[PDB]
Amino acid sequence: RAIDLSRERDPNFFDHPGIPVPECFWFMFKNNVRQDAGTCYSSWKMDMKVGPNWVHIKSDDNCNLSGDFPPGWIVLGKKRPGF
Amino acid sequence: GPGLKQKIVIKVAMENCRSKAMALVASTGGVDSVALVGDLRDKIEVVGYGIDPIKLISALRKKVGDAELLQVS
Amino acid sequence: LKQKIVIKVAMENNCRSKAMALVASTGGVDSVALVGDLRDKIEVVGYGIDPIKLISALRKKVGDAELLQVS
């Protein structure tokens, strides 16, 4: 059951052509079980619904994500292949 | 996202309703692009300028089916 | 077999929104995006999309339309 982002399938994403290509993939888990996944920018921020809560999630230059996640939940990031 | 454009992600209850939701979002003023994304292909990601996400939620609920805002960036 | 179709349309935000909604409403479409420096092209990605029917529909409802790409 443990989280292993090296074995996670890529998210189902779309690189919108009118904005820069986001550098990161994020993965959301509840009790270490994948709930969803997507793309996000490095060195940036987003508001995301994580279980019951709105959570402000910051990303660093290496796609590490930080936020105050509700009990049982986490969102983790990694760099995309070309980035 | 960085720059002038907004990205929002909305989950819509879609079971006909899929095309209806996409068409509604795509018809909205200020929209540059719309995509169905997510592990269950049940989330619509919208990019553009001058889009009010809360009005979009209300419009989807009135015209299509339940809708929930999941991300703003 | 995932497809990408790029269509140039005569937009004479009225015609743009109308074009976008039409394409987005089409069977098999996963994404639509308005592109080009004149914002007169639409990129459509999906599965099982009939580009001939899509062009016919845009010509009937929006304006002249031309296939630039099918892949």
Numbering used by the authors:
A (entry chain C): 31 to 113
B (entry chain B): 184 to 198, 201 to 258
C (entry chain A): 187 to 198, 200 to 258
What text comes from the article?
NLRs are a conserved component of plants' innate immune systems and survey the host environment for perturbations caused by invading pathogens. Intriguingly, the NLR pair Pik-1/Pik-2, which recognises AVR-Pik, also binds the effector via an HMA domain but this domain is integrated between the CC and NB-ARC regions of Pik-1. The integrated HMA domains of RGA5 and Pik-1 appear to have evolved from a family of rice proteins that only contain the HMA domain. Each of the Pikp-HMA monomers adopts the HMA-domain fold (Pfam: PF00403), comprising a four-stranded antiparallel β-sheet and two α-helices packed in an α/β sandwich.
However, following a co-expression strategy with 6xHis tagged Pikp-HMA and untagged AVR-PikD (see ‘Materials and methods’), we obtained crystals of this complex in multiple conditions. Optimisation of one of these conditions produced crystals diffracting X-rays to 1.6 Å resolution. The structure of the Pikp-HMA/AVR-PikD complex reveals an intimate interface formed between these proteins that buries 18.7% of the effector's solvent accessible surface area (1031.0 Å2). The majority of the interaction is formed with a monomer of Pikp-HMA, with 87.5% of the effector's buried surface area (902.2 Å2) and nine residues contributing hydrogen bond and/or salt bridge interactions. This suggests that the AVR-PikD/Pikp-HMA monomer interaction most likely represents the biologically significant interface. AVR-PikD adopts a six-stranded β-sandwich structure, stabilised by a di-sulphide bond between Cys54 and Cys70. Three primary sites of interaction are apparent between Pikp-HMA and AVR-PikD. The first is dominated by main-chain hydrogen bonding between the C-terminal β-stand of Pikp-HMA and β3 of AVR-PikD, which results in formation of a continuous antiparallel β-sheet comprising the four β-strands of Pikp-HMA and β3–5 of AVR-PikD. The second involves the side chain of Pikp-HMAAsp224, which forms a salt–bridge interaction with the side chain of AVR-PikDArg64, and is also held in place by a hydrogen bond of its main chain NH group to the side chain of AVR-PikDAsp66. AVR-PikDHis46 is bound in a pocket on Pikp-HMA via hydrogen bonds/salt bridge interactions between AVR-PikDHis46:Nδ1/Pikp-HMASer218:Oγ and AVR-PikDHis46:Nε2/Pikp-HMAGlu230:Oε1; also, Pikp-HMAVal232 packs on top of the AVR-PikDHis46 ring and contributes hydrophobic/van der Waals interactions.
